[PDB]
Amino acid sequence: ASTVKGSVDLEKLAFGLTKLNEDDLVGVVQMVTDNKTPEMNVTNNVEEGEFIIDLYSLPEGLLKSLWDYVKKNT
Amino acid sequence: VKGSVDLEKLAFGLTKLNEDDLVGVVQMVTDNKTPEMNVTNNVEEGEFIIDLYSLPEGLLKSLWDYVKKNT
Amino acid sequence: SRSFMVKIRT
Amino acid sequence: RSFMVKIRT
């Protein structure tokens, strides 16, 4: 149940995030950060180089935009 | 990675800057522009596009230090 | 409730 | 040879 929100397969989205080139992965981090709401669980540990996100905390519209971006850039 | 700087970490860190602190990145890059740097400021579109691999190692270190200080 | 954690690493 | 970053308003 935790793997689909708003008809977006979050596991498929997460698999696709891994295939992005490093400069296109930064674009995902930008899209998440630029659209951040308080309900979104997003942690950017800058010195560690890790960006931690609860995909289920994201609004359906943003998930759809992230999934479209991931399909476009893989 | 170029110099002592992980370019991907630098890029991730740039995303965490507040909008007013991003202006300081644009300032620092523009103030230190060399021909070999690939830097575009599309002013009317509000876009600042840089090849991090094209930046000299000293500027990358000062950028990384700025990012650590302001995030 | 429901969660799906992703750790995007450099 | 490139790592493009686009800072956008």
Author numbering:
A (entry chain C): 168 to 241
B (entry chain A): 171 to 241
C (entry chain D): 1392 to 1401
D (entry chain B): 1393 to 1401
Authors' own words:
Both yeast TFIID and TFIIF contain multiple subunits and share one subunit – Taf14 (transcription initiation factor subunit 14). The YEATS domain of Taf14 recognizes acylated lysine 9 of histone H3 (H3K9acyl), and the ET domain is capable of associating with the hxhKh motif found in several co-activators, such as Sth1 and Taf213. Here, we determined the molecular and structural basis by which the YEATS and ET domains of Taf14 bind to the C-terminal tail of Taf2 and identified a unique DNA-binding activity of the linker region connecting the two domains.
To gain insight into the binding mechanism, we crystallized the Taf14ET-Taf2CT complex and determined its structure to 1.7 Å by X-ray crystallography. Taf14ET adopts a three-helix bundle fold with a two-stranded anti-parallel β-sheet connecting helices α2 and α3. Characteristic β-sheet interactions are observed between the backbone amides of V1397, I1399 and T1401 of Taf2CT and G218, F220 and I222 of Taf14ET. The side chains of V1397 and I1399 of Taf2CT are oriented toward and essentially buried in the hydrophobic groove of Taf14ET. The complex is further stabilized by a set of additional hydrogen bonds formed between the backbone amide group of F1395 of Taf2CT and the side chain carboxyl group and the backbone amino group of D223 of Taf14ET.
